[model samples]
Target: AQYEDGKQYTTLEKPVAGAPQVLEFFSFFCPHCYQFEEVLHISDNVKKKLPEGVKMTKYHVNFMGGDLGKDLTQAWAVAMALGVEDKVTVPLFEGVQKTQTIRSASDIRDVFINAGIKGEEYDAAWNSFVVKSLVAQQEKAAADVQLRGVPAMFVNGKYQLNPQGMDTSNMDVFVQQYADTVKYLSEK
Candidate 1:
């Protein structure tokens, strides 16, 4: 599994322009996803271990299409648009899972308000046309991949890395394989 592109991790499709991307499909209410984050602390380590020209972006999947999903998805979209994603991601996850304090976009907005991010910046992001488009984009991406659940990883644009069969037995192997996969796929 030593980073062989066409072997260890097969390509689903070549990447788009600029830099290669490592995308994760997740949702606020997924416990398994919560467990994975708790165990791996991936958000904390992504930048440190990611390939030089590769970075991570997350799409909160709406596969089930429910009210909760819509609110949280909107919240997530706004968080990213407002430049508060890094600050709110884990907290929102914890609030929804650990404490059950966050149930809707307003609750998420409160978190941002408490973090001193309210006012025009927040409003602009919340109602911006770009936010709407991004929501559609994420939904389309999830559909394109036929995403069935949270915590799904896609490399470049289409190479899916299933966490179930990953080398989660060892952190070194996990991180290395992940980086290696990105490195190998990026050139394509």
Candidate 2:
């Protein structure tokens, strides 16, 4: 299938201007987000083929998880601030989506602790202004976008990639198509 602007993607009302990048809005409680990150590992594969200075950023959305939504995004922000996203992302996702073990901020703190982050470090990062500001930005970004579902991808903050039209006959095909669209939008 051919990729078209209005068909496969849409221009944003506020296009971010900077180096080409892909920003993803995902929720830990969303099953599809769990599949995208844990099952297909789409973003990791996409990053390998991206042009220089292009990167992928994932922001936790605050629309799911009932009353725990905001807290979960805060945990994400703190992990990002502490530079332990690589260690905590999968575990946190599994705990929340698969194992159903993570219920609150304290449970999230345990995940960070198990990742070799000290309790004191987690506490400090969790309360820091940096993490707080990041959480605010993430929440505002989600609020600004008319998101239809979890695991939304935006290229260079100017184009929103439509997941509904993606080729899903095979995992490789889907990933290649995703990478292609992201590459094309980034170059624009």
Candidate 3:
């Protein structure tokens, strides 16, 4: 479903386990997610980012449900399990958004190779127990959350709907407000 400015954004109903103060649900293919990456980058540069206790985690939303989704989800799970999230996250995003190309499993393997991980290490990791479990978790998150779109932000387990009240054009403002709200929730 397309995102509506003032309407409620779809979110996962259940709280993420371990109950992080902040959780960001996003897909690599989403333009909004790419845009928000700018914010995250700035936040990282300034180091005045999302507050402590507000652990951010990305959940890949395979709304399209095809080979692309399967490959992305699998790669994401493998990367996360192998503790190579940073090595692949930006490259994957850039591959889809900046380069305007779909990322495949081979691409993911290449990224791992570039990151100094042995090809055999990546191969083993991909089929390892951790990766397998993460893949299952990814599937569960998609099924249980009923995610409709990408770039859904959850604060304290509740979805942050567009809060412009009426004016839908204030999405940028809404996103900032949502971040502020998450900050406030983190302090509690």
Candidate 4:
């Protein structure tokens, strides 16, 4: 039940009941987050190795303050509520990375639709309570997480997995290490 605090930038959602959770804090504007994309995908392969009931979720940080931050936060929340997060998340990330622009809701919507989510569904979910809550939650996370940059990972709400802390010279190794960190934490 991971959720954002109504008033602060902190997650109210605890790890699912008794299950452990891995949360990724990221920002589309950060080049490091963009660079970590492929590495984060390694979770798909490592998921099979994780314990039962363990889950991984990505939270896009709205660290930047301004209209752009607000818009991106809303987009992320909308995608999450619509259940099209997986479809749109990477595309949105790529769109921002390739263009370094995230100026409008329409732009994010277009990316979601292009990524295979239905336009109508996208619109409906964009305005739902779920999305709204997530938007608020992201704001809290941005402030409370003390997130200095994008592409930061948290395991069971305790440990942080950072690419910069590892060997940046070998991107593949850094990614593998991240996956390994998840495995290590899930077992704890």
Candidate 5:
């Protein structure tokens, strides 16, 4: 059996983390990427499908930070650091894409506050050295992978897979196949 591309994406000179990791390169400024949540049912799909020991993380691309992306990426770093993503993730995207309500960290801070996050907790995380460190880590990871656009998917730091390039006519089946392929590469 072979992938639809009939080519291997595993080419990271070497792996990084000990655990199997899937990295998604995207930007909040991109229209499709911003709509990616419901477009691909990413929220439910990742949880219900990803195999054990396989972890996924999102890297916000700086290509179109404009004003919102720059602040949003930092805000995401802050939210991720505090383990409070559930409160700000989707809302932030919606605010930027659908509502056009977010412009800077100040605007993003309010979204978290409105989401019931404590101002003190928000401040500590949104404005901290740890945020800088984590942002840098994500930046280096993106650079290492040479990400150029949204929806870029990489497995175990070696293999890259794109569900869009698969069976475009039948998304559900393609998605299932995509998950299976990841599960396969994750093991060996």
Candidate 6:
């Protein structure tokens, strides 16, 4: 009975529904995702517009680089554990896909250090059981979703956004519509 279905978003068959969470599946090696953060700033903009109590989560996909994909996923978990995601995201992207300066965990640690995080702190988080567990869970989730590409958003864990099907006449309109659609699905 709604026009949004099959257009703006599609329901997940195995949705882990409960809280109104916005889960974004992205890869630092993805140029589209880099542009999403640096150019459009869609995630930041949408976060501001989201309803109260709605949590946003980002999952780093492991399907991008062979072994590097998995390593970067662990790095992402480390960033999340240290609460330095905002400080290190762009740097990681630029290092991975742009400058190609990052190739190992040591390099990632350097990036964290550059972002004001102590090397000891980075090492602690990297080895912490919590970050390790989170990384494992993220890898499983990425496979469970069977993601076909980078930069996908799932609202309420079930409603997977189809950006091409939504309004894209302009960035403002697109963000507004994205937030509105997410809010609607959150309530549902």
Best candidate per TM-score, number? 2
lDDT of each: 0.70, 0.83, 0.62, 0.64, 0.71, 0.82
Query: Candidates ranked by TM-score, best first?
Result: 2, 6, 5, 1, 4, 3
**What would the per-residue lDDT of candidate 6 be over residues 47-103, giving only the tens digit for each residue?**
787777878888898888878888889899998887889999989999998899999
Provide TM-scores for the models.
0.79, 0.92, 0.72, 0.75, 0.84, 0.90
The per-prediction CA RMSD against the true structure, in angstroms, equals 3.3, 1.9, 5.2, 7.4, 2.6, 2.0
Rank order by lDDT, top first?
Answer: 2, 6, 5, 1, 4, 3
Model 2 vs. true fold: TM:
0.92
Instruction: Please provide, for model 1 over 131-175, each residue's C-alpha lDDT reduced to its tens digit, 9 standing for 90 to 100.
Output: 999898788777666667677777666576644445677975676
Candidate 2, residues 1-188, lDDT tens digits: the string is: 36787776878887666623688899889998888887888788778888877667788988787778789999999988988889998999989988989998889888999999999889988899999999988876776667757888888668998767777879888888887788877777
Which model is ahead, 3 or 5, in terms of lDDT? 5
Clashes of each: 0, 0, 0, 8, 0, 0
Tell me which of candidates 4 and 5 scores higher on TM-score: 5
Could you give candidate 4's per-residue lDDT for residues 150-182 as a string of tens digits? 666556664555444445577667566656656
Which stretches of candidate 5 lie above 4 Å from their native place?
4-20
Candidate 3: segments with Cα more than 4 A from true spot:
1-20, 39-51, 101-103, 161-176
Give the distance in Å from residue 116's predicted Cα in candidate 2 to where it truly belongs. Answer: 0.9
RMSD, model 6, all Cα superposed? 2.0
lDDT of 3 by residue, 1-188 (tens): 23442353434456555433455566777777776665444223212447564456666766653677677777788778777877777777777778855556687677668777788888988888887777777667555545676665555554554433323355555555555545544554
TM-score of 3: 0.72
Best by lDDT: 2
Total clashes in model 3, counting residue pairs 3 or more apart in sequence or in different chains: 0
Off by over 4 Å in 4: 1-20, 39-48, 100-102, 142-144
**Candidate 6 lDDT:** 0.82
- Residue 3 C-alpha lDDT in model 6: 44
